[PDB]
Every structure is written in C-alpha cells, then in structure tokens.
Design a protein around this ligand. Structure first.
Ligand SMILES: Nc1ncc(Br)c2ccc(-c3ccnc(F)c3)nc12
Ligand SMILES: [Mg+2]
Lengths: 295, 283
C-alpha cells in the first residue's frame, strides 16, 4: 500500500505555472524549481470519499508509468491547508506539450488525421496497453482525451483513475466504469450479474481509431444514455468512408467485435498488418511533429 | 574588484556566436591588434548573479594556468536602459566540444583509443582541481573542449565549488548530488563515467527519457554500463569503477588515475595526431 501522510509539501520542489484544464481534480502546467523542467501536476482535494480512488491511481502510476508509451510519474506531494480549506494532493508526471489526440483532431482541417499518423498513434497505444495487460492491468478509459502527445510527437497514455489491478492472469472484473461512447459492449454490465478483461481496452482503441478517422466516436450525436442503450444492440461500428485502406478497415473489423470471446487479444492485435507493416517510425513521428506545429 | 575592469572596446571584439552557457553566451573572439583568437563569455551584471560571477572569475584566475584547463586571459566590462555586460576572455579551443565531435561522426561513437586519451586528460585536469580543493560540478562532453592540435581543455566554472547544493546537468549528475530532498570531489568522477559512455554511445545513459524521469531513475536504477560487448575489458572495468552509486566505496581521483584503461595507454602523441586527423576530416 501507500501512506498519504508520508508525502511532503511541494514547497520549493515543484511549482504550478498555468492551468491546463480539468480531470477526474485539476491539471496544471507545472515546473521543477531548481531545473526549470516542465511537469503536469494533477491537483486534487483530499477527501475520504475519493481516498479509495486516489490510492489506486498513485499505485498504478508508481508501478507502470516507466514504459515509454505511459506519461511517467515523478512523485506525489500534499499541500497542507488552513482549517478553512481542504488539503490538496499533487500527482507530478511527465508534461506532454502538444496536448491530446482529441485536441489535434479539433485543430485540424477536416477533423481527420492522415492514415499514416493513425497507424503510428494506434501502435504506440497498443505498445502501452500491451505493457499494462502483461502486468494484469485494465485501463478502462481509453479515449483520444487520454492519449497525449509530447513536443516531439511521442504518444503517452494518461489517467489511471478508473484502472483495474487484476490478481490472476485468468482474472476478470465487472465494475462498469468509463466513457459511454468508448465503452465495450461487455463493460456495459449494468443489467447483468456476471465479467470482462483486458479485451475491453481493445474495443476503446477501435473507437479512438474511428475518432481519429472521423473527428468523433460512433454515436456522438446521441445522449450518453442513448449510446449506452445502442452500443450492445447495434452492430459493431465501421469507418463510413471507403477511401481508408483495406488494412485500416480490417484493423477496425478486428478491434470492434461485440463478442469479446471471439475478439483478438493484445499480442495478436499487435501482429495485425495495419500496426506491424508500417513505415519509418521516425519519419511519421517527424511528419506528425511538423503538423502539430502551425498557428 | 569588478569596477576596476576596463571596457573591451578596441581591445577584443566578438566575431561569431559559438554557442551558449550558464545564463551567458559564448562567442568566437578576436584580439583586435594581434588578430589572435579567444573565447569570450558575454554575461549581464546583476546583483543576483554577482555571488556566482565573482567565483567563476576567481577559479578562472587561480587554476586555469594548468594544461587541461582552458586558460583565463582576462575580464572586461561593457558599460551601458541596458544592463552592464561582463566578458570573460579565455583560450580559444578551435576544434569545439567532445559532444560536437560525437555529433559530427558516423555512428556517433569514438575509437576507444580516443576515449582513453580524452578521459586521461579530463582526469589530469580534475586531479589538478581536486588537489586544489575544487569540485567542477558540471563535467559533460559539452564542457570538454578540443584545440586545433586535438588537446583536451576543461571549461565553465560557473557552478564550481571551494558540500550539498544540487547543481549540474541531470544525465551527468551523481546519485549523491541528487540531494533535492533535505557530496564531495567524487561527484565529478561519476560525470566522467557518464561522459565516457557519452563518447562510447553518442549520448549519456537514460537519454531516451526526460531529464525529470532520469532525475528519478539515477538513484533507484543500478549504475550504468556500456551496452556493447565489443569494447575492451579495461574500458568495461573503467566504467565499473567510475559509476559506483555509493560514493564512499567509489574510488578517489588519484586511484582512478592508476586504472589500467588510463595508465596503460600508448603514444600520447600518436593518438592526439590520430584524433587531430579525425577532427580535420569531419570539417
Ligand atoms: N501529463 C500531461 N502533460 C500535458 C498535458 Br496538456 C496533460 C493533460 C492531461 C493530463 C492528465 C494526466 C492524468 N490524468 C488525467 F486525467 C489527465 N496529463 C497531461
Ligand atoms: Mg591554459
């Protein structure tokens, strides 16, 4: 376990620079005092309600953020406040300068990405998830908003706030948590009594590949509740355009299989030609970096 | 006394910008009358950096007269809306840094013979400072320079000591120098091991990760080693001796100089010529 009372005040160690946005708590552009090196700082208030969730996120971050496709944990701190205010805990991690995949799409003519970039980005997500799954971890919130880009267009995964730490390799879970539009049919276990696994993350990856392809996830136009209803009943989504590759159309086809038993595992999905057969990982990264930079 | 320093107007002149340093720029300079080349470090005078400016000019005047340390020629102050800028004039090291030489080299690796030669000169230079109660605190390929005749010179006394203050370059920092949560001459010897790996692999260990994830990893991870098995058993041993996370057990400068990778090294003239030939081939 972790002891929160053992965490020091961030005083002259780190400092907040500007507010980036909000999360599951706020997210700040922060800096390491002595070095001037940037970090993202997740400022969240200490409550006995969120305590069970706060503990898991710090645990997940300390253990697996070492992999290159996961935004790395730098440490945690607790800013102690007067009797008026709540104590706020800071999660310090790798600052991903370019922002989210979701933002990149928004700030792009047509709100679509070049297939080469989708293949590059998807691979990095798959590498990152393979790390997690091999370590008996389900992310449970894979979406473009949680797939970040550094200044050098490197792909990093974020938000362990809804993650799962399975015990056995044959272990299952049945909590029902995530973002409606990106949730897997099985994870919609709000009406059944029994179970899902690492496969759930692979569905969300297919939804995010569609998000990068179409600008938004399938069923974007409906209320999250309508989507929750439709996702199980409607057939597995596909790219509306015929201009995308046969490899991409196949990748989506493999990713989005409503029956998780028949849906391919992380290791086999990594073998897929859309992921495996890809050009100079360095050339695409640079091409993407060049696109990130504009107005 | 800083106010006793003359204006460099007509004495020395800046020719072109070589690069940048510790909150100050470095230019290729020229003595007006003689046409002779010098390194001029141009930095703004402030009462904040005053404590740091004073130490750099002090060490420069006291220890630069050694052969492995780029020699101090003098200081000047441009009197100026604008801030007064101080110029620190030293010997011009024509061939540039070890870091640059690596960058402008196919494979970004140096011949082991050159690494042994270069390392020895750094050790000679550090032995000088450590015997004189001085910690460099910023030993890196960018601060190890080469003259036209491929001679090795040390630079930047801006973070030096006469300790625990936490200053340097993340990758090169010694575990003990990472005293960022409330260290001696040995700290420089770690950085030398990192720079030997830099000359061997093109970059320091943990280069693939942000300086922050490196700051985190350096204490926790085991001491780095050369990833290739093609390097000598002597080189592999030298790195092994240099990089000992426990500074108490890490060998001193005098004993590290005794090491066979440094000591058992041939014609200091043949290697310097070989290196000179490589410097000249690249440009
Ligand atoms: N590390 C980063 N760097 C830059 C930016 Br912009 C980030 C935005 C959001 C997040 C983030 C991290 C953890 N949990 C979340 F829900 C969001 N991280 C950022
Ligand atoms: Mg000299």
């Amino acid at each position: 376990e972790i002891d929160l009372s053992a965490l020091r005040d961030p005083a002259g160690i780190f400092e907040l620079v500007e507010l980036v946005g909000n999360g599951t708590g706020q997210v700040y552009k922060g800096r390491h005092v002595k070095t001037g090196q940037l970090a993202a700082i997740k400022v969240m208030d200490v409550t006995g309600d969120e305590e069970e969730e706060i503990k898991q996120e710090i645990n997940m971050l300390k253990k697996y953020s070492h992999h290159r496709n996961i935004a790395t944990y730098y440490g945690a701190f607790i800013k102690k406040n007067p009797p008026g205010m709540d104590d706020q805990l800071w999660l310090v991690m790798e600052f991903c300068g370019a922002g989210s995949v979701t933002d990149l799409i928004k700030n792009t003519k047509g709100n679509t990405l070049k297939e080469e970039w989708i293949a590059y980005i998807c691979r990095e997500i798959l590498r990152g998830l393979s790390h997690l799954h091999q370590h008996k971890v389900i992310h449970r919130d894979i979406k473009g908003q949680n797939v970040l880009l550094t200044e050098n267009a490197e792909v990093k995964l974020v938000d362990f706030g809804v993650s799962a730490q399975l015990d056995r390799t044959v272990g299952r879970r049945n909590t029902f948590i995530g973002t409606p539009y990106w949730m897997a049919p099985e994870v919609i276990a709000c009406d059944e009594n029994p179970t899902y696994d690492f496969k759930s993350d692979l569905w969300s990856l297919g939804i995010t590949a569609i998000e990068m392809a179409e600008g938004a996830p399938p069923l974007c136009d409906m209320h999250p509740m309508r989507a929750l209803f439709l996702i199980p009943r409607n057939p597995a989504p596909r790219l509306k355009s015929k201009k995308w590759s046969k490899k991409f159309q196949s990748f989506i086809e493999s990713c989005l299989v409503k029956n998780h038993s028949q849906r391919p595992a992380t290791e086999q999905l990594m073998k897929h030609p859309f992921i495996r057969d890809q050009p100079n990982e360095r050339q695409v990264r640079i091409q993407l970096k060049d696109h990130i930079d504009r107005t």
